Amino acid sequence: SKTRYYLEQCIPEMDDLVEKGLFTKNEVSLIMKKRTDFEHRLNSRGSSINDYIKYINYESNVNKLRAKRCKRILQVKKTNSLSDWSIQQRIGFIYQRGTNKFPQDLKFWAMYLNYMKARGNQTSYKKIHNIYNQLLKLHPTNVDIWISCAKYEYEVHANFKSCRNIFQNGLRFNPDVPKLWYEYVKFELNFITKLINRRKVMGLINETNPALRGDIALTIFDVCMKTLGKHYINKHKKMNIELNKETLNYLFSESLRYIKLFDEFLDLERDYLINHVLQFWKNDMYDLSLRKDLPELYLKTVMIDITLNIRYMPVEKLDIDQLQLSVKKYFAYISKLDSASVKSLKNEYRSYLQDNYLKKMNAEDDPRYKILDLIISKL
Amino acid sequence: IKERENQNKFERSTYQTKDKKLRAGLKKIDEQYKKAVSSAAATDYLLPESNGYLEPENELEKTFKVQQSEIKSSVDVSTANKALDLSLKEFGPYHIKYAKNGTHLLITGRKGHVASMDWRKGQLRAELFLNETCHSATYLQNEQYFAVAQKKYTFIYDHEGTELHRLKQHIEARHLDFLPYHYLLVTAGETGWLKYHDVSTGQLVSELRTKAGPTMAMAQNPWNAVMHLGHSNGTVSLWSPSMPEPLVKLLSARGPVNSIAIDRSGYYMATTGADRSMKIWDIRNFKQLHSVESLPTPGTNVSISDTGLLALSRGPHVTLWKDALKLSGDSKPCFGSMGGNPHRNTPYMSHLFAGNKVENLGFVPFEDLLGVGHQTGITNLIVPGAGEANYDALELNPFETKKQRQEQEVRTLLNKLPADTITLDPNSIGSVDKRSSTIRLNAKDLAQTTMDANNKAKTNSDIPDVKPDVKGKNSGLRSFLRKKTQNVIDERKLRVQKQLDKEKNIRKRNHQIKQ
Amino acid sequence: MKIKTIKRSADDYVPVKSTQESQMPRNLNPELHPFERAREYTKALNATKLERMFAKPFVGQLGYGHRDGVYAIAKNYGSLNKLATGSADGVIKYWNMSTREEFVSFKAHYGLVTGLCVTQPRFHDKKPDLKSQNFMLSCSDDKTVKLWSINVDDYSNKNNEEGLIRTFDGESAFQGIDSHRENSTFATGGAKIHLWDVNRLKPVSDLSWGADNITSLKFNQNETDILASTGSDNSIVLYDLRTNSPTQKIVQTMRTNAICWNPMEAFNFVTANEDHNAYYYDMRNLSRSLNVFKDHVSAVMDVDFSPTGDEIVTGSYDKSIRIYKTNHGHSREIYHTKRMQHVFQVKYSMDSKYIISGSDDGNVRLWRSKAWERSNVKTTREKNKLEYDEKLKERFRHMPEIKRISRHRHVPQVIKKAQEIKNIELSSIKRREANERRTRKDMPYISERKKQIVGTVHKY
Amino acid sequence: VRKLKHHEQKLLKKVDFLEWKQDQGHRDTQVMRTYHIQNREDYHKYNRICGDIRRLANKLSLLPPTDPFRRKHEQLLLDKLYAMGVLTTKSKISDLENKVTVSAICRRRLPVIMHRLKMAETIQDAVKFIEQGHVRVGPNLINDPAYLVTRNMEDYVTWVDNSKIKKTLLRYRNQIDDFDFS
RNA sequence: UUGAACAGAGAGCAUUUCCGGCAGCAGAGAUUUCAGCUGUU
Incomplete structure (x- = not known):
C-alpha cells in the first residue's frame, strides 16, 4: 500500500544517518514509528489538513535535531550526504500532497509558499512559479494571491514585465476589486520613480517623456473609474438617479484615496497628478453635473485644490504670492458658490491655513505671519 | 545494492553461456534477486515492536529464581491481566489450545467440559457439557469452527456450539491438528491410523496406516506441513498425505515418545521419551544436536515458542531454556552450572504447580505468555522473550475485525494448497523432475540420441565389455548371465555367453602364459 | 533484574x-x-482458470453488414475509431466503430471492390479539410480507381461534398491498392504495378517486374519509400521509390496472399501463404525466414501486425482467426463462430486492443485482442492484481496442468479433424524421410525456415 | 462465511462447511428431532440393528424362492418384528427391506407410545413426565425415555398411582376417590 | 524548404564556467536570520 511505499522511500535516509555517527538504530526506529503514524493518517480516510501540518512540524523538528547532532558529533555544519536535503524534500512533498488533496486551504498554500521561499538556495524560481500557477488557476478570484505573486516577482527578481503581466491578468479576472487597481497604480508609480532615480544616479555618476510624467498611471486611473463604476452599478442593479449618485460618491472615495497615495509619492509630480484627477472630476460623470449633484463634494474638491496649491510646499518656506493666489482662488470659489457654501469653504480654508502656518510660525516671529493672521481674520 | 547485516534470513537457496539473450536474462534475474533481497532486509527499520527479555544485573541474580508474582508486579497492567488463572476443579484435567491469532482459547476437560472463549475480552463463545471422555480439541481456519476428539468419534462444532458434523471415519483419535493453508484436519489416536480430512469440502483426503500401534505423540511441522508422529517403539515418523509409507523414520528414544515439538522455522525438533530423555534434532539434515539424558522425571510435554524458547513440563514442573536449539555444545540444556560455568545452559525459567500435573503446554501467539493446562484448569505464565513481537497483518491479525475475518476466510479458501503439494522440501514445486535430463535436448540432440540407441545393438554396447583383468568371480558378464532367467534363452543372453566364454578363454591363456 | x-x-x-482505516503491520x-x-x-x-472464465472475445458486429461478402478492409491510421469496408457488390461503407454504425455507403464500382485504402490527399492548389472530411481510395475490376470524401463529426469547430472527387482510369483491372504514408502517391496492382499521383490523371510510373500480374501491395510504414507486392507466380517482389525500381524478387512454393510490414521494425514483414502458414521475413536477407507461423488449416487469406509490433493476426480460409506472438511459431488464440465463414480480411486496431474481421457472409466483426481483458479503467488495486496475475502466469506457464488449462480452446469439428489428418500426413512424411535418410549416407538437413523458398533473383 | 461472488463460486463449487456427504443429509439429526432422541448414538445403534435386518433379508432373497428354509425364516422374521411393533403389517416380504427404518423403531419408544396413547400432548412432554416419575409399565416404574414398548406391553403403559397428573385428570372428570389414593 | 528578427515555455540535453569552505565588512528581514560584497582556502 501507499503507506508502505512511502516508508520504504524513507529508508535510504536512515541508511545514511546510521552510516554517519548521527543517529542510533533504535532512535531511527522511534522516528520511523512516528512517521508510520503520520503516513497512515495521511493515506487513510478521515484525514485533515491538521495532520499535514503536524507531520510537517514533526519533520521540521527532526531536521533541527539532525542539525544539532551533526554540529555536536562530527563537528561539521553539514555532511555532503543525502540526509541534509532529504527532510527538506520530504517537507516539500508533504506540502505538495496536502495542497493537491485540500486545495481550498489558503493558510496551507501560504505555508507552502513561505517554506519554499525560505529555503532559497536549494529551491528554484521554476518551483515557485509552478506553485503560483497552480494556486492562481485554482483561486483566480483571490486578489491577494495576484498581489503576492506580483510582489514576489518585483522584489526578488525585479521582473517588471512579469509584474505587469501578472497585474493585467489579475485585473482581467477581478475588474470589480478596487484594491488590485490600487496596487497596479502603486507598482507603476514605483517603476517610473525607480527609472527617474536611476537616470538621476547616472547623471550624478557621469563627469520630456510621458513614462516619466505618469500617463500610464493616469490611464490606469481612468480605466479604473469606468470599470469600477460599471461593475458597482452591475452589483447594485429617480431611483436609478439615486443609485448613480451613490456610485459617484463611492468612486469619489477611491479617487480621494488615490490622491492620498499621490501625496505619499513625494518624488513624482504631485501637482501634475492632482491636476489630472481634478480635471477628471471637473468633467461631468453619470449624466449629471458634478457640482449640482454633490455640492458638498464639489466644495471639498475646490478646497482640496486650493489647499494643495501650497500644501506641497512647506510652511517654513511658504510663498506669500502663492498663498495670495490660493486665497484669490478661494475668494472666486466663494463668490461662485452659495452663501452657506461660501461660509463653509471659508471656514475650511481658514482652518487649513491656520493648521498650516499659524501653529508653525508666530506673528511676532514672522512679519508675514501678522499679515496671515489679518487674512484669517478677514476670512 | 548495499550489503546488510540481516540479509541471511532473506537469502534463498538454489539447487558462462554462449547465448546472448540467455546471458542477459540470467544477469537480469540475478540483479533482481539481489535487489529484492536487499530491499526486503531493509524493511527491518519498519518493525514496530521489539522482543521481550529477562536479564540478570548481578552475579547472584539467576533468571530461574524469578517468580510469577514478581514478574506480574513488574510488568504493565495489561500483560498482568493477560496472565489469567481459571479454577475448574470438576471436569479436569484440561487440554488447552490457542487460536493462531491467539485471540481465542479452547479448553477441553477430560470429563466433557469443552469451552471456547475470547480470553482477552472475557467473552464466552461456546460451552459444552458432553458428559463423555474428551481428549483434545483444535480450532479450524477461524475461531468460528472447532473440532473435539471425544470418546469414539470426532465432532465439529460452530461458533455458538451447535454440532455440525460427526466424523464416523475418525475413530478414537487422541491427537488433533489443523494445517491452516491446506484446510486439513489431521487426526491420530488409538487405532494407529493417520487421517487427513478436508474441512472445506468434507472429503477425507488420506488414511495412512502407521503400523506402529497407537500414536503416543503428534506435532506438525509449520514449515512444510509434514506430520511428526511419535510411537511407543521410540521412533518419530514423518508423514505426507500423498505417500502411504512415512517419509523419514527417526529412532529418537528407547521407550515410548512422550512429546514432540517443532520450531517455527521447521529446522529443529525436540522430543521427550519415557526413558527420561529429551533430544533436540536438526530436521533438514536429520542429525541430532543434543540428547539430555536422565531427567529427574520423564518429560510429559515439550513446546517451542516463536522466538525459540524450549518449554519442558514434567509432572508439576515447567522449565524453559533459551538458545537451547543451536548447534554448539554450549547450548545443551542443563539444570545446574557447576560452579558458575558460563558454557552451561542453565534454565531460562522454571515454575512449579505444586500438587498438580501439567496436561499440555501452548505458547500464546504474539504474546509473552505460556498457557499451561492442568488438573484444575488453565494458567498463563508471563515469559518475557517468548512470543514474536512483530506479526504480519496479512497472515494473522490479532486485532482482526468481523469483516476482515470474512474476507480472509474466502481469500484463504481461494488459495488453499492441494494436499499433494506437501513434501519434505517446500521448494519442490516448480522444479524439474529428477528422472528428467539436466540439460535441455532439442530436436537435433534427441535425434542423435535415438540414432545412438538404434546403433547400440549393432555396436554391442548394451552387454558389458569383456574385461580379462577382472576375475570371473566378479565379472559383469557372469553376473548378467546369472541374473537372467535360466529357462528363457534370448539373443542378448547368447551374445553375453559368447563374450563371457571369450573373456574366460583370454584369461585362461594369460594365466597359462604366466604359469 | x-x-x-x-x-x-x-x-x-x-x-x-x-x-x-486499520493499520497493517x-x-x-x-x-x-x-x-x-x-x-x-x-x-x-x-x-489461468479465471482467464478461461473471463475469455469473452466477441465485442460485436458493425451495422447490418454488407449485402455480399467483405473483401476489402482498411483502417484509418490517424483516427482510432474509423474503418472502410468494401464488398463484392461494389458497395463501400465508412464506419464509426464507437457507435458501430456507418457514416456513409457508396455504390462505388460495378465490379468487385478489389482494393481499399484510407488517404490524406495533398493537392498542389488546395489543402483538404482533414479535420472535417476523410478520404478513401478504391480500385475495382471495372478498370477504375476512385477517390471519395466523407463528412466526419469528430470536431465541432464550425457550423460540403460527400462523394466522388476524382476518377483515375486505367487500361486493365486493378487488384490491390495502397497509399504512401507521407506523400500523395499511391500504387495499384493488377496486370502491372503502377505508381500514381492524386494530382495526375494517369500513372506516374510503371514498376512491374516482367510480364506477370500482381495481386497485393503494401507500403512500408517507417521507410515509407519501400513497397512490397505479391504475384500469382508465387513471387514476392520488393520495390524502392528512391531508385524507382523493383528491388528484389523471391519465389516460394505457393502463392502469397497478403503482406504486412512491422510498425516498429522497418525491415521485417509477414506474408500470408497458401501453405496454410505465414512467414516472417527480413528484407536484407530473403534466403531464410525469421519465423514460421503454422497453426492454420486452410490458406491464410490475410495478415496484420499489432501497432506495437509484438503480435500478428491471421485470418484464413478455414473460417478462423489466429493470433501469434512474433517469438513463437504457433498461435496464442483462435477465434471462430458458426455464423462466421471464410475470412478474407483481418485488421488490428490502432489501440492494439481490438481485431476487426470481414468474412464471406458479409459481416464485419469486432473481437478483443486479449479475450479476458476488459475496457474499463482500472483502479490501482485492480491494476496491480491483474499485473501480478499476468507475471505469475508467465512464471508458472511451464507447469503441466497450468499448460493444460491454458492451451485449451473449443475448436470446430472440421478444423479438429483436419488437424489430426495433417498430423497423420506429417508423420507419414517423417517416416518416409527417415527411410530416405537411412538409405542415403549423406543427406542435407534443410531448415523449416528454408523449406518454403524455391529461389531468389539476387544471390547472397 | 459471506456470500460468495460469482467468480469465487466457480473456483469454490465444492466448498460447504455445514453439509458434507458423510453427514448423509443429517438424517440422524432429523430423526432425533422428530422423536426427541436425547442420546447421540441411539440412531446409529438403531441403524446397525436395521442393517442386520436388511442384510438377513437380502440373504433370504438370494435363496431360491421355493425353499422351505427361506419361507420359514422370512415368516419368523416378519412375525418377530410385527410382535415388537416395528412392522405395521405382515403381508409383504419386501417390507423387510423397504419398511425397516430407524424411525420405525423410534416410534416404539415410550414417549412416542404415550403421545399416541394421548397420555401427553407432545413427545417432549412425555419425555419430561417419564423422567419426573409419573409413568409405570405394569407394576414397574420406568424413568428411561429410551425404553422400547412391545405391542403386548402397550396395554400396561399407565400413569403411576399417587400421580398429580392422575389426580388432575380424575378431578377434571369429577371422579376422584381419595380412598383409592387417586 | 530555409534564414532573420521578436516573443517565449520550464519542458528536454550538455557543461572540462561558478556556488553549496573560512575570515572580515556592510545592508536588510523577523537578539537572531538572510542573501550580498571584499579577501583567503
Whole structure:
C-alpha cells in the first residue's frame, strides 16, 4: 500500500544517518514509528489538513535535531550526504500532497509558499512559479494571491514585465476589486520613480517623456473609474438617479484615496497628478453635473485644490504670492458658490491655513505671519 | 545494492553461456534477486515492536529464581491481566489450545467440559457439557469452527456450539491438528491410523496406516506441513498425505515418545521419551544436536515458542531454556552450572504447580505468555522473550475485525494448497523432475540420441565389455548371465555367453602364459 | 533484574477515529510466510482458470453488414475509431466503430471492390479539410480507381461534398491498392504495378517486374519509400521509390496472399501463404525466414501486425482467426463462430486492443485482442492484481496442468479433424524421410525456415 | 462465511462447511428431532440393528424362492418384528427391506407410545413426565425415555398411582376417590 | 524548404564556467536570520 511505499522511500535516509555517527538504530526506529503514524493518517480516510501540518512540524523538528547532532558529533555544519536535503524534500512533498488533496486551504498554500521561499538556495524560481500557477488557476478570484505573486516577482527578481503581466491578468479576472487597481497604480508609480532615480544616479555618476510624467498611471486611473463604476452599478442593479449618485460618491472615495497615495509619492509630480484627477472630476460623470449633484463634494474638491496649491510646499518656506493666489482662488470659489457654501469653504480654508502656518510660525516671529493672521481674520 | 547485516534470513537457496539473450536474462534475474533481497532486509527499520527479555544485573541474580508474582508486579497492567488463572476443579484435567491469532482459547476437560472463549475480552463463545471422555480439541481456519476428539468419534462444532458434523471415519483419535493453508484436519489416536480430512469440502483426503500401534505423540511441522508422529517403539515418523509409507523414520528414544515439538522455522525438533530423555534434532539434515539424558522425571510435554524458547513440563514442573536449539555444545540444556560455568545452559525459567500435573503446554501467539493446562484448569505464565513481537497483518491479525475475518476466510479458501503439494522440501514445486535430463535436448540432440540407441545393438554396447583383468568371480558378464532367467534363452543372453566364454578363454591363456 | 515484555498500545493498531482505516503491520521474515512456491503456484493456477472464465472475445458486429461478402478492409491510421469496408457488390461503407454504425455507403464500382485504402490527399492548389472530411481510395475490376470524401463529426469547430472527387482510369483491372504514408502517391496492382499521383490523371510510373500480374501491395510504414507486392507466380517482389525500381524478387512454393510490414521494425514483414502458414521475413536477407507461423488449416487469406509490433493476426480460409506472438511459431488464440465463414480480411486496431474481421457472409466483426481483458479503467488495486496475475502466469506457464488449462480452446469439428489428418500426413512424411535418410549416407538437413523458398533473383 | 461472488463460486463449487456427504443429509439429526432422541448414538445403534435386518433379508432373497428354509425364516422374521411393533403389517416380504427404518423403531419408544396413547400432548412432554416419575409399565416404574414398548406391553403403559397428573385428570372428570389414593 | 528578427515555455540535453569552505565588512528581514560584497582556502 501507499503507506508502505512511502516508508520504504524513507529508508535510504536512515541508511545514511546510521552510516554517519548521527543517529542510533533504535532512535531511527522511534522516528520511523512516528512517521508510520503520520503516513497512515495521511493515506487513510478521515484525514485533515491538521495532520499535514503536524507531520510537517514533526519533520521540521527532526531536521533541527539532525542539525544539532551533526554540529555536536562530527563537528561539521553539514555532511555532503543525502540526509541534509532529504527532510527538506520530504517537507516539500508533504506540502505538495496536502495542497493537491485540500486545495481550498489558503493558510496551507501560504505555508507552502513561505517554506519554499525560505529555503532559497536549494529551491528554484521554476518551483515557485509552478506553485503560483497552480494556486492562481485554482483561486483566480483571490486578489491577494495576484498581489503576492506580483510582489514576489518585483522584489526578488525585479521582473517588471512579469509584474505587469501578472497585474493585467489579475485585473482581467477581478475588474470589480478596487484594491488590485490600487496596487497596479502603486507598482507603476514605483517603476517610473525607480527609472527617474536611476537616470538621476547616472547623471550624478557621469563627469520630456510621458513614462516619466505618469500617463500610464493616469490611464490606469481612468480605466479604473469606468470599470469600477460599471461593475458597482452591475452589483447594485429617480431611483436609478439615486443609485448613480451613490456610485459617484463611492468612486469619489477611491479617487480621494488615490490622491492620498499621490501625496505619499513625494518624488513624482504631485501637482501634475492632482491636476489630472481634478480635471477628471471637473468633467461631468453619470449624466449629471458634478457640482449640482454633490455640492458638498464639489466644495471639498475646490478646497482640496486650493489647499494643495501650497500644501506641497512647506510652511517654513511658504510663498506669500502663492498663498495670495490660493486665497484669490478661494475668494472666486466663494463668490461662485452659495452663501452657506461660501461660509463653509471659508471656514475650511481658514482652518487649513491656520493648521498650516499659524501653529508653525508666530506673528511676532514672522512679519508675514501678522499679515496671515489679518487674512484669517478677514476670512 | 548495499550489503546488510540481516540479509541471511532473506537469502534463498538454489539447487558462462554462449547465448546472448540467455546471458542477459540470467544477469537480469540475478540483479533482481539481489535487489529484492536487499530491499526486503531493509524493511527491518519498519518493525514496530521489539522482543521481550529477562536479564540478570548481578552475579547472584539467576533468571530461574524469578517468580510469577514478581514478574506480574513488574510488568504493565495489561500483560498482568493477560496472565489469567481459571479454577475448574470438576471436569479436569484440561487440554488447552490457542487460536493462531491467539485471540481465542479452547479448553477441553477430560470429563466433557469443552469451552471456547475470547480470553482477552472475557467473552464466552461456546460451552459444552458432553458428559463423555474428551481428549483434545483444535480450532479450524477461524475461531468460528472447532473440532473435539471425544470418546469414539470426532465432532465439529460452530461458533455458538451447535454440532455440525460427526466424523464416523475418525475413530478414537487422541491427537488433533489443523494445517491452516491446506484446510486439513489431521487426526491420530488409538487405532494407529493417520487421517487427513478436508474441512472445506468434507472429503477425507488420506488414511495412512502407521503400523506402529497407537500414536503416543503428534506435532506438525509449520514449515512444510509434514506430520511428526511419535510411537511407543521410540521412533518419530514423518508423514505426507500423498505417500502411504512415512517419509523419514527417526529412532529418537528407547521407550515410548512422550512429546514432540517443532520450531517455527521447521529446522529443529525436540522430543521427550519415557526413558527420561529429551533430544533436540536438526530436521533438514536429520542429525541430532543434543540428547539430555536422565531427567529427574520423564518429560510429559515439550513446546517451542516463536522466538525459540524450549518449554519442558514434567509432572508439576515447567522449565524453559533459551538458545537451547543451536548447534554448539554450549547450548545443551542443563539444570545446574557447576560452579558458575558460563558454557552451561542453565534454565531460562522454571515454575512449579505444586500438587498438580501439567496436561499440555501452548505458547500464546504474539504474546509473552505460556498457557499451561492442568488438573484444575488453565494458567498463563508471563515469559518475557517468548512470543514474536512483530506479526504480519496479512497472515494473522490479532486485532482482526468481523469483516476482515470474512474476507480472509474466502481469500484463504481461494488459495488453499492441494494436499499433494506437501513434501519434505517446500521448494519442490516448480522444479524439474529428477528422472528428467539436466540439460535441455532439442530436436537435433534427441535425434542423435535415438540414432545412438538404434546403433547400440549393432555396436554391442548394451552387454558389458569383456574385461580379462577382472576375475570371473566378479565379472559383469557372469553376473548378467546369472541374473537372467535360466529357462528363457534370448539373443542378448547368447551374445553375453559368447563374450563371457571369450573373456574366460583370454584369461585362461594369460594365466597359462604366466604359469 | 530487567523485566521487559511485549507491550502493545491499542492506539498503534486500532485507530481512535471511526473513519480511519486499520493499520497493517508487516514483517517480511520468511518464517511468518511459509509455502512460497506452492502459494504462488495456486495463485497462478487460479489466474489461468479465471482467464478461461473471463475469455469473452466477441465485442460485436458493425451495422447490418454488407449485402455480399467483405473483401476489402482498411483502417484509418490517424483516427482510432474509423474503418472502410468494401464488398463484392461494389458497395463501400465508412464506419464509426464507437457507435458501430456507418457514416456513409457508396455504390462505388460495378465490379468487385478489389482494393481499399484510407488517404490524406495533398493537392498542389488546395489543402483538404482533414479535420472535417476523410478520404478513401478504391480500385475495382471495372478498370477504375476512385477517390471519395466523407463528412466526419469528430470536431465541432464550425457550423460540403460527400462523394466522388476524382476518377483515375486505367487500361486493365486493378487488384490491390495502397497509399504512401507521407506523400500523395499511391500504387495499384493488377496486370502491372503502377505508381500514381492524386494530382495526375494517369500513372506516374510503371514498376512491374516482367510480364506477370500482381495481386497485393503494401507500403512500408517507417521507410515509407519501400513497397512490397505479391504475384500469382508465387513471387514476392520488393520495390524502392528512391531508385524507382523493383528491388528484389523471391519465389516460394505457393502463392502469397497478403503482406504486412512491422510498425516498429522497418525491415521485417509477414506474408500470408497458401501453405496454410505465414512467414516472417527480413528484407536484407530473403534466403531464410525469421519465423514460421503454422497453426492454420486452410490458406491464410490475410495478415496484420499489432501497432506495437509484438503480435500478428491471421485470418484464413478455414473460417478462423489466429493470433501469434512474433517469438513463437504457433498461435496464442483462435477465434471462430458458426455464423462466421471464410475470412478474407483481418485488421488490428490502432489501440492494439481490438481485431476487426470481414468474412464471406458479409459481416464485419469486432473481437478483443486479449479475450479476458476488459475496457474499463482500472483502479490501482485492480491494476496491480491483474499485473501480478499476468507475471505469475508467465512464471508458472511451464507447469503441466497450468499448460493444460491454458492451451485449451473449443475448436470446430472440421478444423479438429483436419488437424489430426495433417498430423497423420506429417508423420507419414517423417517416416518416409527417415527411410530416405537411412538409405542415403549423406543427406542435407534443410531448415523449416528454408523449406518454403524455391529461389531468389539476387544471390547472397 | 459471506456470500460468495460469482467468480469465487466457480473456483469454490465444492466448498460447504455445514453439509458434507458423510453427514448423509443429517438424517440422524432429523430423526432425533422428530422423536426427541436425547442420546447421540441411539440412531446409529438403531441403524446397525436395521442393517442386520436388511442384510438377513437380502440373504433370504438370494435363496431360491421355493425353499422351505427361506419361507420359514422370512415368516419368523416378519412375525418377530410385527410382535415388537416395528412392522405395521405382515403381508409383504419386501417390507423387510423397504419398511425397516430407524424411525420405525423410534416410534416404539415410550414417549412416542404415550403421545399416541394421548397420555401427553407432545413427545417432549412425555419425555419430561417419564423422567419426573409419573409413568409405570405394569407394576414397574420406568424413568428411561429410551425404553422400547412391545405391542403386548402397550396395554400396561399407565400413569403411576399417587400421580398429580392422575389426580388432575380424575378431578377434571369429577371422579376422584381419595380412598383409592387417586 | 530555409534564414532573420521578436516573443517565449520550464519542458528536454550538455557543461572540462561558478556556488553549496573560512575570515572580515556592510545592508536588510523577523537578539537572531538572510542573501550580498571584499579577501583567503
